[PDB]
Design a protein around this ligand. Sequence first.
Ligand SMILES: Nc1ncnc2c1ncn2[C@@H]1O[C@H](COP(=O)(O)OP(=O)(O)OP(O)(O)=S)[C@@H](O)[C@H]1O
Ligand SMILES: Nc1ncnc2c1ncn2[C@@H]1O[C@H](COP(=O)(O)OP(=O)(O)OP(O)(O)=S)[C@@H](O)[C@H]1O
Ligand SMILES: [Mg+2]
Ligand SMILES: [Mg+2]
Lengths: 322, 261, 261, 316
Amino acid sequence: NLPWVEKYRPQTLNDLISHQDILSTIQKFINEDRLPHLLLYGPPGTGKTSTILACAKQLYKDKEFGSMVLELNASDDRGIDIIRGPILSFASTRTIFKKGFKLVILDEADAMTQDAQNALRRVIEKFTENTRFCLICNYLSKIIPALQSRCTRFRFGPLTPELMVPRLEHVVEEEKVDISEDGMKALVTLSSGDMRRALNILQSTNMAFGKVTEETVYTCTGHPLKSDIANILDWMLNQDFTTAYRNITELKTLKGLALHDILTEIHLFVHRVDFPSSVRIHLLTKMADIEYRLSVGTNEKIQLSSLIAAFQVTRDLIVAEA
Amino acid sequence: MFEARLVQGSILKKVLEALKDLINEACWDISSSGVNLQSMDSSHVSLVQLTLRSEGFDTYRCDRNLAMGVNLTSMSKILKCAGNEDIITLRAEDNADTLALVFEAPNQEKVSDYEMKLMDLDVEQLGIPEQEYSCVVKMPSGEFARICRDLSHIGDAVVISCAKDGVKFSASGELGNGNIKLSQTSNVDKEEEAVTIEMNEPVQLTFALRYLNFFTKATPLSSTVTLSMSADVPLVVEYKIADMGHLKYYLAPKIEDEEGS
Amino acid sequence: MFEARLVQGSILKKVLEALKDLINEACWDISSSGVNLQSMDSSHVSLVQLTLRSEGFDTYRCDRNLAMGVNLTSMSKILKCAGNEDIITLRAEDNADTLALVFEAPNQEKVSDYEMKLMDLDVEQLGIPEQEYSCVVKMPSGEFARICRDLSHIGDAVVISCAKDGVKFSASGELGNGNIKLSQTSNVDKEEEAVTIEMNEPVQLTFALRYLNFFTKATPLSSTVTLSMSADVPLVVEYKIADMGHLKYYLAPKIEDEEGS
Amino acid sequence: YELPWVEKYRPVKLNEIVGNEDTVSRLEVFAREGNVPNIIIAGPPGTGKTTSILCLARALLGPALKDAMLELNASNDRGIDVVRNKIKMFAQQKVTLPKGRHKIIILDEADSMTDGAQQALRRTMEIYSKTTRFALACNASDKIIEPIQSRCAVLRYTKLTDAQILTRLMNVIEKERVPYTDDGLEAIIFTAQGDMRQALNNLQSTFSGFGFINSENVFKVCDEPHPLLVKEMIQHCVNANIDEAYKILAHLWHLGYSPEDIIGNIFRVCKTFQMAEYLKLEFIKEIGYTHMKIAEGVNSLLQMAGLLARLCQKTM
Ligand SMILES: Nc1ncnc2c1ncn2[C@@H]1O[C@H](COP(=O)(O)OP(=O)(O)OP(O)(O)=S)[C@@H](O)[C@H]1O
Ligand SMILES: Nc1ncnc2c1ncn2[C@@H]1O[C@H](COP(=O)(O)OP(=O)(O)OP(O)(O)=S)[C@@H](O)[C@H]1O
Ligand SMILES: [Mg+2]
Ligand SMILES: [Mg+2]
């Protein structure tokens, strides 16, 4: 029928969670008619659009939501023609409706250039009493400090799994699918603290297989397995160079892994492996260099051999220290 | 089954040029009282109400309420097709996707059936508060059109001041200030120049220029114009067009500057 | 304190629509004789000399001689908001910069005070020679306006000739040749339709068509226009207002060098 | 409908401007001399380049300000046609002014114009120099061509110093009767990053939010990486430690911060750290190298861990 995010989107200030100080301050400002221009910034899928849509439906009714709220998003290119186009003409006009300010929801405001953000700074500072902007963005640092200096910012952080699991339990009680502990651990680990990807992965696991366990999530998503990276690190740490190179290139051409994902999972693994500090520094410097060398677009086998090379120098130093 | 017949064809051929450039579509609502048309502009500033009662028509057949959405771009060229003193009829079926405008050609020899499609437009009625207006002015229509054409040469936002003395239309631009004040024109032979003030408390509202020009595009509908304004109520421009009904324009003021001391 | 009361705004309207496409900024000298406007165009080829006498106005008062300078397109747009049957009050004071145009409207109920901002341009006064010329021809102004519009199409610049017989217009344009010659037009019933030759020495001089076209926009000011040509002093086009004053346009020739062959 | 503190407490005279010292004295001399040249005012954004020429114009013209003062921002159209029409039109008007008084045409953001606009601005500044005096507020003076700045004076504005921002902030605090702590003042300095309007906006935001000033309340409404934790990360990188520094980095990474935000706070803390000078310069070079990696498009946690390992490797 419909995706679960479009079915169970929150519509109330209490239905959005972990932002209780932010939502309390927004409710405090909006009961006293003191709401400023808003700048909601954070990771994707943490409740940026739905919070301001809940606040808009609190402020305005269903009939006047389409009139006193203008929404611009990624479908609109954000250059200099837009800021002298529809958003200026929208902000510089009155309405035949009740005497309240307008609202402009500008999705992905970090994609505006410095000239575009300065023109938007002119538009924001020119019209304040009749228009209250809402710029929502991923990176705060991609916008100018003047724009940060005229609109109040709010950091929509990620959702802690301790607070994330009651909503997952609610959506697994409402929608009857098979739930285990390792499936929920895979959900709250692979989702990376945002509800949108957790609900999408849960719905895709329901529609693809039917049950939600750890290996079903891993096979539906393609995330590297923990025992897979354990085998990669074991081959790098206690095998010969040609043996490890052949084993890891067969695992790469079999499992569909890539060297960037191997690099980040090995980077997460080597801070669990209790190395001495010096060989930890050597491994981290070498792996960051391999990440940059893969970023600049070189051959992949040679960088794989350099990763095995760093771990072979590591294993020589570890045995020599033993 | 909707059937309407006008007495003279020039009613539509004066009322639809006022909607040629102002609004983009037309929302005809049918009822036993007659036909109405409420449309908000695309910029959500200008509002047009058109109410034509059933007694003004030559004949009027309707059974249930109908909501109808039409495009004014082709209708604003189809107004040039009809004559001035011919008899026009609007015909609409129950389940059809096309409406017929049946009248006579300007040759007075040829029956003209112009068929126009329906745009299924999802619009909702705003609902006018219809509050007690703090200042009512009765003025001529051509005088208002020529004063908007006069202040179109000075600034892009006129200022209407309404006190017990009367109305002051003032335009300030890069050229220089120009103000025009009217008072007490009851000493005339014709009854259409009675520029009358009907309320006491003064108001001072700044309006856009192009919107008032689009409003004054409807001069030959009637002889007099009722301008209603208040402190926060929008400007209301009321035309008592003939005997079949009336027309209303609603205009929000401009945003005032931060002139606090 | 300078206050001039123009009896009718039609002559001011025709003066400004004559001077609209020629002069960048208009300078007025104010004395007890009246008002004077001696200025150059935007290209320093032509000269305008407008004289308005003191007895032509309704009330004309001036204490000290005033040398004001105003933007012209701004004044054209100010005068565009005026009727044709209204008295015009030009107001200025001793030690300020605002020029006020106060007139009635075609409603004849409302006053209209249009303020304007002057300029601070110091312009050297060029002495008019006031000498005799080589040919003087009296001709109705509509003839000159229509022959300027008629002769603008054939060429880009036109050579005009005057002799003992009459006046002659020639154009060697890209389309071909256009030559007219008119003499002895006094044998009609009307007194305006008359061409009178005063002097003896024949002259042939070439002038730009656009300056003649901008000179002929003073057509309904005067029923009859005067043309004065001479070999050295420039071409003079004089419109005599009936009871107000006069307006002269002076036009410099263009280079037409003979072929070496 | 209360006004924000950015425009509510903007100074109205040259004696209240704390930014420059020699330039504000030059403006004070110019306000009484009456022979003001055309000027170009250069500096960083937000240092007060248009609340100074505005105060000079208001002290110069006085009651004739509304007729003999034109502020042209980049808020309006920035084409060649508007500069050709409006500036020449305004310069051609007459104002009854005293002997040492001229019209002032402020051009805010005069660096975004093309070469044709400034090469026509040469003649507009040269011809109407008796009537009006120009004042171009430019963000960068190198983008201004040499013949423009040859015929006009050049005035330089620096970035607000933290002592000057301290004086202005304590004046605003004493004016608004705000209770305060020194840690909250340090926090509003750190979140201010040298910009005056940013400092005033953050102070009024935390005053409207929580009221009493303390260092914990400043970072609830701004939510940068906390300088205590970032300073602990730099201290662990300088004390030959990688595990505790990566523990702090992972703590600041599981709070969802971008690499750009963490490395910007890393450089801002490492500016005002306390260590050897050559160690500071090597650390700033490594942080700049890693920021070049991150802004190039490598924004993983592994790059920040490699930065931490390189900082720990520089210090033996
Ligand atoms: N706090 C929350 N509580 C419950 N569900 C949430 C919460 N935040 C997000 N969701 C869910 O995740 C979906 C995504 O939320 P949105 O706010 O629309 O995304 P976003 O935060 O704007 O980030 P973008 O748009 O991808 S940059 C919502 O439709 C909900 O289904
Ligand atoms: N030295 C200062 N003393 C007092 N207030 C200052 C000072 N510098 C800046 N401000 C304040 O900061 C704001 C000045 O912003 P603007 O001058 O408009 O920006 P700008 O520096 O001119 O850069 P532009 O004009 O955008 S290129 C006002 O709110 C002033 O009150
Ligand atoms: Mg969104
Ligand atoms: Mg500024």
